[PDB]
Amino acid sequence: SGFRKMAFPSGKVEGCMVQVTCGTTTLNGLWLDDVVYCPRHVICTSEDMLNPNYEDLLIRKSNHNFLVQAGNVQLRVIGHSMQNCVLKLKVDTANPKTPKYKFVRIQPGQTFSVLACYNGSPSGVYQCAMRPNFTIKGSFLNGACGSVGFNIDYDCVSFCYMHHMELPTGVHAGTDLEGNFYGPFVDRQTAQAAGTDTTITVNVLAWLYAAVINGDRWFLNRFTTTLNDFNLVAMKYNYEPLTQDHVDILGPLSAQTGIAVLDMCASLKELLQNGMNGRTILGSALLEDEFTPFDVVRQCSGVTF
Amino acid sequence: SGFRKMAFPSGKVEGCMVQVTCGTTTLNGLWLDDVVYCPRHVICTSEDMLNPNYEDLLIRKSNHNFLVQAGNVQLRVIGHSMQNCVLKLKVDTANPKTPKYKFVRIQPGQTFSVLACYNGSPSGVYQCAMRPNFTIKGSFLNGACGSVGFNIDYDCVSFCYMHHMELPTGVHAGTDLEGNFYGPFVDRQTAQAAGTDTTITVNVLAWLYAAVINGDRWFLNRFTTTLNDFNLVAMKYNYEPLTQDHVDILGPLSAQTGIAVLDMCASLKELLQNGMNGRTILGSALLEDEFTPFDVVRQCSGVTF
Numbered sequence A, B: 001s002g003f004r005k006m007a008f009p010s011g012k013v014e015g016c017m018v019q020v021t022c023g024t025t026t027l028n029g030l031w032l033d034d035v036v037y038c039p040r041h042v043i044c045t046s047e048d049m050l051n052p053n054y055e056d057l058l059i060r061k062s063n064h065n066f067l068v069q070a071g072n073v074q075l076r077v078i079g080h081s082m083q084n085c086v087l088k089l090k091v092d093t094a095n096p097k098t099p100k101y102k103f104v105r106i107q108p109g110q111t112f113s114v115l116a117c118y119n120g121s122p123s124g125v126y127q128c129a130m131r132p133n134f135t136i137k138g139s140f141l142n143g144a145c146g147s148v149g150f151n152i153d154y155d156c157v158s159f160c161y162m163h164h165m166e167l168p169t170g171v172h173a174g175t176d177l178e179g180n181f182y183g184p185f186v187d188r189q190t191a192q193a194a195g196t197d198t199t200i201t202v203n204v205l206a207w208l209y210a211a212v213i214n215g216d217r218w219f220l221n222r223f224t225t226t227l228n229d230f231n232l233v234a235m236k237y238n239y240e241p242l243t244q245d246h247v248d249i250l251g252p253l254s255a256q257t258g259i260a261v262l263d264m265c266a267s268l269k270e271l272l273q274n275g276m277n278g279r280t281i282l283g284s285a286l287l288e289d290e291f292t293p294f295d296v297v298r299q300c301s302g303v304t305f
């Protein structure tokens, strides 16, 4: 028993981190086989970042201008190209620690682990959700760019995020590993802001199931609701609409606990309308929305990699 | 910016996990050089666990009865001994992935990362504090025993915890890597309970400094207090006494922010007496006590390993 915010084991990703320096700008890169992936603004000076023409800046670079270091070993760069907001450096050595991997683009509401790195070296690992406004609530400093987010499935690392920038209120934005931003953001140092966020309803429901599994059942009421009636009530509280796809994904937790999804919805509705009356659920005084249904099943069933 | 509960990168520890089976009991072991460390109740049947005589049970075992698997490779056991509540299996192969390491016994209030494992394979990583009642608030299922807790310092893994058991209310107990339990617990399936816990005051103060660093400053008041007066007030709210050692360890955060420790204490005193008035600090509606001063400095300064 117990329920904690839990990251994937980071070792397979640690074996892929390198540092990339161009001029006096240094950030992190991801070394998979004989390619290093990193944010394209490694080619910018501080002044360039205010309004960069990345294509122009990259024209003026050649392979040898990129100093790629894997530990204290320099990796010779033998080619380069830009794909959207990511630079791809071909090196003459394939990474022997390359895991089985995929590049995926995740959906708002899905979670992933972040290996926060500086100068090619890992600092820590934490779990994040892609918010509905396409930011993540991360923890990043100067030099963190190129840190990646990922999920693991058995032996396969699915990379889904590369870190690029911090937005007002201390939230974070980046790209998939093809260099395409999540959300309407651009990699330029000019005023940008995320839109209003929303609460990930299906994840709150997943976490209420986690609570029941752990014996924290006080909030279960005796009622049911329709999906329509739930979504009308949830809308007022800035909860995203619960879809039938969401109901279907909650099925395994529903079947395990014997609580119908729409009965859980009736209990959540009462929590939204009435509050928690000073009580906690799984030790939290707020409803938690950064555990997916699969996160709950992995943790409570002991899925390994 | 941003502040998250953050674990150490787990790769160095992942390379040390194996599975240990004796009879039909399987749990995790830690393989360092040519020794595997694991909980001694691997030698118990379910019935033995109700009242085990470990010395007697181990007399009846020989080396070959221990099936140690590192992936799909069996490690031949060539010796064994018991040290307190840990079994040490000497194997004929040294682990080539052994990191620089130490065995340490940590103090209540200190934090560590847990790599939760099943059948020798990692499931996830999360951060925990050794509570003042010598339990941890973990997340563990059947088969998790032998999972370890650790801190990293540059290249050196300090192992501080091995998981053995779950106590009432879903909290957890275990040993250091010399097999000595934290707290008054024994590895026997008989009713045991932790004593009343207390809040780790120095960690709450550290986290309030983390909040100021991130710009969450609303709770700063205009007052100071004496250490004596603070500790009288904190006692009522089941906060542990703040010592001069604690004040000294908070020094770097105090100097960085320009807020004297005793001025922070005056702000915490007001939070304890008045509550948070429905507000959050770093997104939490409760005061958080599982970040140490060094945890705050590592995360906000980007310390790497």
Ligand SMILES: *C(=N)[C@H](C[C@@H]1CCNC1=O)NC(=O)[C@@H]1[C@@H]2[C@H](CN1C(=O)[C@@H](NC(=O)C(F)(F)F)C(C)(C)C)C2(C)C
Pocket: A027, A041, A049, A140, A141, A142, A143, A144, A145, A146, A163, A164, A165, A166, A167, A168, A172, A186, A187, A188, A189, A190, A191, A192, B001
């Ligand atoms: C990569 N190493 C950093 C990570 C930042 C630094 C502080 N916390 C982080 O996550 N990325 C940058 O510094 C990027 C980069 C130029 C400026 N930048 C920002 O993150 C800035 N944000 C914005 O300009 C805004 F608001 F649009 F997101 C900054 C004000 C420095 C936080 C480029 C090329 C976007």
Ligand SMILES: *C(=N)[C@H](C[C@@H]1CCNC1=O)NC(=O)[C@@H]1[C@@H]2[C@H](CN1C(=O)[C@@H](NC(=O)C(F)(F)F)C(C)(C)C)C2(C)C
Pocket: A001, B027, B041, B049, B140, B141, B142, B143, B144, B145, B146, B163, B164, B165, B166, B167, B168, B172, B186, B187, B188, B189, B190, B191, B192
């Ligand atoms: C190791 N694989 C398990 C981990 C447990 C299992 C459920 N969650 C966990 O953390 N350790 C055990 O099953 C140990 C073990 C016998 C019984 N045990 C317990 O954890 C039991 N707890 C107690 O007996 C109590 F309350 F004293 F802590 C159990 C009721 C199964 C949770 C031995 C040898 C102590």
